[PDB]
Design an enzyme around this catalytic site. Structure first.
Site, PDB file in Angstrom:
ATOM      1  N   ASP A  35       0.907  -1.021  -0.045  1.00  0.00           N
ATOM      2  CA  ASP A  35       0.010  -0.147  -0.015  1.00  0.00           C
ATOM      3  C   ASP A  35       0.920   1.414   0.218  1.00  0.00           C
ATOM      4  OD1 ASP A  35      -1.899   1.958   0.239  1.00  0.00           O
ATOM      5  OD2 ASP A  35      -2.320   1.396   2.509  1.00  0.00           O
ATOM      6  N   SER A 199      -0.990  15.685 -11.930  1.00  0.00           N
ATOM      7  CA  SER A 199      -1.289  15.387 -13.427  1.00  0.00           C
ATOM      8  C   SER A 199      -1.352  16.505 -13.975  1.00  0.00           C
ATOM      9  CB  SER A 199      -2.346  14.438 -13.281  1.00  0.00           C
ATOM     10  OG  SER A 199      -2.905  14.146 -14.696  1.00  0.00           O
TER      11      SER A 199
END
Length: 330
Positions: A35, A199
């Site tokens: 994770d 992004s």
């Protein structure tokens, strides 16, 4: 040194991925959920409340000649999906894909929440976010990667998750045969303890690319892609009959649909998520309403590039002095 381990979807939907991890001496192999959005290595154990264990493999520290109680240390964690676990702490030898760390903090669960109990395939978590998020008290502990880093050939690990198929976690090297084209690297902020990046925009299907900054985290422990409501609405508007259902808990769509792809930007590069990656199947057995793999982050407080996004790429987690993230198509 290096390590290389195969990671395998837990079910037919790729709800999560498990990777075998050797703990203790002799080795006890547990299947852990790696994770990159958390920083605790915790396991089902011989100390876990018996009624909260249902099929998981447990770590038994008393059977490990290298286990040592980390005296006074406790841990307690709550995840974004509302699940939780807590317990005490041992140090022991931990190996992943041939890479060994001695003295790793292995957090032994005394209690786990129902969602963990109900998932027989996940024996614990191995956190790969920054050690500043580790929950051990009163002495915070380091992640497996942080402990291994100085010994690695290169201070990196890579995630290469498969769509409905196994993939690979590598430590200490970049497998140049595992991706196509070039890797585009992008800046990371560690201020919140995550692999947080920005992004450069998105496209829906064959549509034009929208240049817009989307801050979010690369999180292998989250199944879906969680993005701003504007972006998510633009995606689902291209699917006839799709709608947000408060009763179900997100966007659903007719199972008869063909889903468009979704593209996200990494610098000037583009990663394309095929439409099929966005299908999470019937909301309940036999239903013709299917659950979407792109969902709104509104009310989470952060955008999350979870498995839906990451499995479309070869992803480099660069833990150099100034960390960065790399993405390549594959």
């Amino acid at each position: 040194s290096t390590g290389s381990a195969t990671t395998t979807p837990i079910d037919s939907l790729d709800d999560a991925y498990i990777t075998p991890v050797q703990i203790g001496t002799p080795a006890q192999t547990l299947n852990l959920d790696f994770d990159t959005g958390s920083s605790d290595l915790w396991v089902f154990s011989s100390e876990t409340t018996a009624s909260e264990v249902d099929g998981q493999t447990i770590y038994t520290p008393s059977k490990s000649t290298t286990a040592k109680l980390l005296s006074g240390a406790t841990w307690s964690i709550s995840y974004g999906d509302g699940s939780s676990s807590s317990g005490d702490v041992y140090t022991d030898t931990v190996s992943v894909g041939g890479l060994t760390v001695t003295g790793q903090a292995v957090e032994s669960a005394k209690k786990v929440s129902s969602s963990f109990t109900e998932d027989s395939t996940i024996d614990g978590l191995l956190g790969l976010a920054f050690s500043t998020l580790n929950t051990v008290s009163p002495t915070q502990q380091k992640t497996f990667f942080d402990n291994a880093k100085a010994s690695l050939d290169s201070p990196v690990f890579t995630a290469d998750l498969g769509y409905h198929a196994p993939g690979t976690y590598n430590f200490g090297f970049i497998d140049t045969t595992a991706y196509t084209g070039s890797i585009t690297y992008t800046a990371v902020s560690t201020k919140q303890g995550f692999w947080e990046w920005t992004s450069t925009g998105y496209a829906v299907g064959s549509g034009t690319f929208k240049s817009t900054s989307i801050d979010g985290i690369a999180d292998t422990g989250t199944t879906l892609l969680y993005l701003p409501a504007t972006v998510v609405s633009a995606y689902w508007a291209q699917v006839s009959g799709a709608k947000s259902s408060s009763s179900v808990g997100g966007y659903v769509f007719p199972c008869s649909a063909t889903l468009p792809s979704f593209t996200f930007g990494v610098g000037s590069a583009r990663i394309v998520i095929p439409g099929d990656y966005i299908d999470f199947g019937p909301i309940s057995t036999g239903s013709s309403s299917c659950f979407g793999g792109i969902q709104s982050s509104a009310g989470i407080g952060i955008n999350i590039f979870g498995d839906v996004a990451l499995k479309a790429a070869f992803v480099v987690f660069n833990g150099a002095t100034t960390p960065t993230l790399g993405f390549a198509s594959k």
